Amino acid sequence: GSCKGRCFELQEVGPPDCRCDNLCKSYSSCCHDFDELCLKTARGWECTKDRCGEVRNEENACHCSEDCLSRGDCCTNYQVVCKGESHWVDDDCEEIKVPECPAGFVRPPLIIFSVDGFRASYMKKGSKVMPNIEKLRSCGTHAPYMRPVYPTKTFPNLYTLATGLYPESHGIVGNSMYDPVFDASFHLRGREKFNHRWWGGQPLWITATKQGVRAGTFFWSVSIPHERRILTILQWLSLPDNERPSVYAFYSEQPDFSGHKYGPFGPEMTNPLREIDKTVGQLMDGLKQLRLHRCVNVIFVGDHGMEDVTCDRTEFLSNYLTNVDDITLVPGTLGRIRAKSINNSKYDPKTIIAALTCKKPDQHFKPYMKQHLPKRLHYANNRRIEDIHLLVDRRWHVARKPLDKCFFQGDHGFDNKVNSMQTVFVGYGPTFKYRTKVPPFENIELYNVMCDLLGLKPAPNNGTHGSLNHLLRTNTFRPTMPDEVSRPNYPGIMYLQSEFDLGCTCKVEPKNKLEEFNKRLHTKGSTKERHLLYGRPAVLYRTSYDILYHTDFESGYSEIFLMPLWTSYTISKQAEVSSIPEHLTNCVRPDVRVSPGFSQNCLAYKNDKQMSYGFLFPPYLSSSPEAKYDAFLVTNMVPMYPAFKRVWAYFQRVLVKKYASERNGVNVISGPIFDYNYDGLRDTEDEIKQYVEGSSIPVPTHYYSIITSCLDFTQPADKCDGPLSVSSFILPHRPDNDESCASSEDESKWVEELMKMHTARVRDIEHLTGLDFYRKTSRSYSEILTLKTYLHTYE
Ligand SMILES: *[C@@H]1O[C@H](CO)[C@@H](O[C@@H]2O[C@H](CO)[C@@H](O[C@@H]3O[C@H](CO)[C@@H](O)[C@H](O)[C@@H]3O)[C@H](O)[C@H]2NC(C)=O)[C@H](O)[C@H]1NC(C)=O
Ligand SMILES: CC(C)CCC[C@@H](C)[C@H]1CC[C@H]2[C@@H]3[C@H](O)C=C4C[C@@H](O)CC[C@]4(C)[C@H]3CC[C@]12C
Ligand SMILES: [Ca+2]
Ligand code: NA
Ligand code: NA
Ligand SMILES: [Zn+2]
Ligand SMILES: [Zn+2]
Fold first, then answer.
1. May I ask the CATH class of domain 478-795?
2. For 6, 88, 242, 735, which has the most beta carbons within 10 A of its beta carbon?
3. No. of helices (H) and no. of strands (E), the chain
4. Which amino acid residue places its CA nearest to atom 22 of ligand 2?
5. Nearest Cα to 377, choosing from 647, 331, 368, 350?
6. Where is this region: Nuclease-like domain?
7. Which member of 76, 154, 160, 635 is catalytic?
């Protein structure tokens, strides 16, 4: 019935018994004397000189008595004030080559110090505002920023940090959610969120416990002052060896709240940032008192950033939809729409999307069916994600009705590539590198690293294990390149023209007469050397495919899908763009290396009134009129809606040359993607739901390209000694350009904007294709893993 000797105990007390732990207030279950015995505030949180050597008074919040280290409850400045010691922040940076842990410690503990809404740029305020944090940052390992997951809200990001999973996989797809199987709603406030049914994957504290590594309780009732959260972690670190946890978390609600109230750039942000730094100082001084400051690994990390958003910048659905009372909207910095009643027969989600599409010239949001959202968001494969999504412009809100000087000036939740949404990462301790800056990375990657830091085997997750090995002084995980599953055929020129009945045509009979004299036509030669700079992609599933060589490009032609899985080619800085001649406009040529039965047919395209075709290697970038004939082979053709061809042709005729001109040449790999069930993974044949009329030619859901060059732009892409530079895209293969409100204009006014929105990581394409890229480079495999997780954000 009492918390005497039980405050913040790690023991698991079940109902109906009254609790004394971290979360007892959140379940309204604390013992009667919890708030007096456990939440002591008397005399504050700092020893003063007059308290040194005091007789312990149990009413005090913390202690300055000679027994306080034994009881695990000294004020964090005890040794500084009472024993002549220095504050941790005033000590020189000194390298930590190996953990320096006291007797009985079997591994370096990990402490995760999570700060809500800590925008990356807040680090610019520097040592005068945040000296402790700046010391951690400069002395340890840090990134310029860390990318959160979408939506850029607390619960999805905190659970992603904990699991290594995208929200669509871990299940916490918003701060608010409705699950139609449960027929229940989850909210940041209330009891429903405590039900385990909502939470998938395997978070770090469970991974640890299952593997015999003791975890502290990661969560803190909001009533518990930050100073007490720090003192409680320090108390647990003082426990005997068989009770003491190896992994801990601290959470602060700041600077998110001040960001919401004052906006991210307010001068009012200074004080909350000082207060957080003061708490970091208490932790570090407290660790130093326990001789753990060169033993513990500390991660300082945020969940997302903060943008300027005021009530004046609100769009209302009632200004677009005449029947707004028939819908429910999850509102604000994103929109999710569903029917207010399932019994409604009037609600048509096609009419909703149409009514929200490009209706006002300065419209500050864009509707999408969830399968059409940028694939980089990985935000579709969950029954809790409504079919209808609104991507809201940064700085704006979307609300249902106008009834919904402002009370708030900041918010977050926007697209996770937006600058204002970026957050922070610092690692400090023996296992992290010393005085080391690392490139920006995604928070999905951290679970693997935290498992490594605790000697744990990670549960399956969406990180790329090894991509963050460069953060650590000592790695225990060494990644290995996956084995190729399907081996290609290398077919020669074996068939005659007469064997093909594809209905294809090239009246004039245009032909390179010289091909009949060219015995070495379509042999390897220097094709692989010039056009496959990083080796052939490996096929990681079982299929039948052919390698096809040409002067200007190489491809891996699927005999199952009747098109390339990948097409690879290099374009020099000085390459010339040429037009398609009049006689070749509608030219498609049989490929004498590939049987008629494993080829597409032009009659399917004639009969399909909605479908046209494009080419993966562009005829516009042919090296000669002779070589241009190769680009019209049936084995280079892919099905394309006419609307999409507007995009593709601009990319191929204009942008590839632009990129080559900007980057000292580029290597391009392009191909189809099939993701009809929107799971982010390559479809099997049975999962493909649309074909070209009357044929077995499957229709891609998307088209990708990976554009690689030398990071050292003084070297051409084909003679690069060092690190690589990559940008990639996964373009939606859509039968209209409704996504692009400016699409009636010249392609120079809209196509690039579309492509930037659909930027992608090479890893995203790998999941979607079952291909493995960059298999033959001069780079270490861990460096290649970092490259494959890179996202070009265009911010
Ligand atoms: C993000 O990571 C998660 C976790 O690894 C991936 O989800 C997992 O996906 C696999 C493959 O679809 C699921 O397992 C499969 O089960 C079927 C049986 O129906 C079997 O045929 C396969 O051999 C395989 O075992 C798995 O259940 C699922 N797990 C979780 C926890 O969600 C997800 O695919 C990743 N996302 C991306 C975009 O890579
Ligand atoms: C109101 C806030 C201050 C605190 C809210 C914390 C809340 C989200 C936490 C509390 C308990 C957590 C669950 C508990 O650790 C057990 C598991 C097992 C694990 O395998 C899946 C996650 C789950 C259900 C935790 C989810 C988060 C919970 C509910
Ligand atoms: Ca799929
Ligand atoms: Na057609
Ligand atoms: Na349009
Ligand atoms: Zn948050
Ligand atoms: Zn917030």
1. alpha beta
2. 88
3. 20, 29
4. 199
5. 368
6. 533-795
7. 154
